[PDB]
Design an enzyme around this catalytic site. Structure first.
Site, PDB file in Angstrom:
ATOM      1  N   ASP A   1       0.854  -1.210   0.000  1.00 10.10           N
ATOM      2  CA  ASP A   1       0.000   0.000   0.000  1.00 10.10           C
ATOM      3  C   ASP A   1       0.885   1.254   0.000  1.00 10.10           C
ATOM      4  O   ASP A   1       2.127   1.117  -0.066  1.00 10.10           O
ATOM      5  CB  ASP A   1      -1.021  -0.050   1.131  1.00 10.10           C
ATOM      6  CG  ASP A   1      -0.473  -0.057   2.540  1.00 10.10           C
ATOM      7  OD1 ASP A   1       0.734   0.230   2.722  1.00 10.10           O
ATOM      8  OD2 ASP A   1      -1.297  -0.356   3.458  1.00 10.10           O
TER       9      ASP A   1
ATOM     10  N   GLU B   1       3.665   1.065   2.486  1.00  7.15           N
ATOM     11  CA  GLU B   1       4.662  -0.028   2.363  1.00  7.15           C
ATOM     12  C   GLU B   1       4.287  -1.230   3.249  1.00  7.15           C
ATOM     13  O   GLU B   1       5.195  -1.863   3.818  1.00  7.15           O
ATOM     14  CB  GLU B   1       6.048   0.545   2.698  1.00  7.15           C
ATOM     15  CG  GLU B   1       7.187  -0.118   1.975  1.00  7.15           C
ATOM     16  CD  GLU B   1       8.496   0.600   2.297  1.00  7.15           C
ATOM     17  OE1 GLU B   1       8.720   1.715   1.757  1.00  7.15           O
ATOM     18  OE2 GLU B   1       9.257   0.060   3.117  1.00  7.15           O
TER      19      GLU B   1
ATOM     20  N   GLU C   1       5.706  15.482   8.736  1.00  3.67           N
ATOM     21  CA  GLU C   1       4.933  14.322   8.257  1.00  3.67           C
ATOM     22  C   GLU C   1       3.686  14.140   9.124  1.00  3.67           C
ATOM     23  O   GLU C   1       2.561  13.948   8.599  1.00  3.67           O
ATOM     24  CB  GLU C   1       5.831  13.106   8.353  1.00  3.67           C
ATOM     25  CG  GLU C   1       5.130  11.791   8.091  1.00  3.67           C
ATOM     26  CD  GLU C   1       6.119  10.668   8.213  1.00  3.67           C
ATOM     27  OE1 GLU C   1       6.294  10.172   9.342  1.00  3.67           O
ATOM     28  OE2 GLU C   1       6.773  10.351   7.196  1.00  3.67           O
TER      29      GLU C   1
END
Ligand code: NH4
Length: 372
Positions: free
Chosen positions: A167, A170, A327
């Site tokens: 996905d 990973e 992130e």
């Protein structure tokens, strides 16, 4: 809506988003994921780069976005022989191993950055087709500039779209991921509906395979009226709104779009900060800027401006002293026990993540808030 305090802060974060992306763009044109994060630095992803390129294109930096598409195009043209070999192997009935497929990580000089046995992903090829067609449409550019690279990506996706792969995160190479199928769909519909590509030999095939992808998602990728993380699952993933806007499995006003936005908000959105998936232990399973931006983008496209603004404000509140967007942030953690070991192995969370800045630029643009 917004007072001059909020507008000034959001305008400045847009300007800084443009600066961070274009400052770190490699000399060859690649957008890196994160210049300072230990585990990502030195590599480019087509997923990160394509969303980054779309925010830059919306911002209006035609030169920067163009150099990214030049880089991807040249990298793909160099794989013409590899893709041809994979297709011939299929034609002999010799299904190539994940270890032989096109890579996920690229070096800035276009080499494999990683062994696809460990990270085989098809989504990034579909996102690039979407990104390059959308850019060319927005700025009136001739797609022949990037066509030979487009030809490689199309031939590859027409052959390999239905293969199990890892996905976006990973994980779970054995499954077929609805946001991966969605990314491929968006790319194929983009090239198949593009008037400049009407004479391509694959023109009709791209819409027929996009229809096949929607068949498969209708059969196995919808439960209780919402999209699911992977075919045959019940759970959602924060990536799934991308299947609505921009990849187009369903339009924003569809009941399945509505129910997917609702399921993602209920299961994964805490106070505007969106988690990836319920089992996520990466840095304890924090709240991802790019997923809050994606849900906000989808809420704007569905006519929920208020819900979109709330997600934008949440993102802007995660900007650090310099305006850098991480992130993810740990204000809520799905698995708080797991965070220390990640900080220990890999250091503090990737900051800036260019994809966070790209997604910020897109959501600001959807709300008509880029500096004038
Ligand atoms: N939109």
């Amino acid at each position: 809506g917004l007072d001059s305090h909020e507008l000034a802060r959001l305008h400045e974060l847009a300007r800084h988003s443009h600066a961070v992306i274009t400052r770190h763009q490699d000399a060859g044109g690649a957008y890196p994921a994160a210049p300072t994060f230990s585990a990502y630095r030195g590599y480019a992803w087509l997923r990160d780069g394509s969303f980054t390129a779309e925010g830059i294109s919306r911002y209006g930096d035609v030169a920067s976005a163009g150099r990214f598409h030049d880089w991807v195009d040249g990298v793909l043209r160099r794989r013409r022989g590899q893709v041809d070999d994979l297709l011939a192997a299929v034609d002999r009935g010799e299904v190539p191993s994940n270890e032989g497929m096109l890579p996920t990580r690229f070096t800035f000089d276009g080499n494999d950055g990683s062994d696809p046995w460990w990270d085989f992903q098809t989504d990034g090829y579909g996102m690039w087709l979407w990104s390059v067609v959308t850019h060319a449409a927005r700025h009136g550019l001739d797609l022949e500039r990037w066509r030979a690279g487009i030809d490689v990506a199309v031939d590859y996706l027409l052959a390999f779209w239905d293969r199990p792969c890892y996905d976006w995160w990973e994980e779970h190479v054995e499954h077929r991921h609805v946001s991966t199928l969605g990314a491929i769909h968006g790319g194929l519909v983009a090239v198949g509906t593009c008037a400049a590509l009407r004479s391509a030999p694959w023109s009709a095939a791209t819409l027929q395979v996009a229809a096949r992808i929607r068949s498969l998602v209708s059969a196995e990728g919808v439960v209780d009226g919402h999209l699911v993380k992977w075919l045959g699952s019940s759970a959602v993933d924060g990536s799934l709104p991308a299947c609505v806007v921009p990849f187009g499995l369903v339009p924003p006003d569809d009941d399945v779009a509505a129910m997917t936005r609702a399921a993602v908000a209920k299961d994964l959105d805490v106070d505007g900060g969106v988690h990836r998936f319920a089992a996520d232990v990466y840095y304890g399973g924090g709240q991802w800027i790019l997923l809050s931006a994606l849900l906000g983008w989808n809420l704007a496209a569905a006519g929920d401006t208020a819900g979109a603004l709330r997600h934008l404000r949440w993102i802007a509140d995660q900007a650090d002293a310099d305006g850098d967007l991480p992130e993810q942030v740990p204000h809520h953690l799905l698995h708080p026990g797991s965070r220390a070991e990640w900080v220990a192995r890999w250091g503090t969370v990737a900051t800036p993540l260019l994809w966070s800045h790209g997604m910020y630029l897109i959501l600001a643009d959807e709300l008509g808030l880029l500096p004038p």
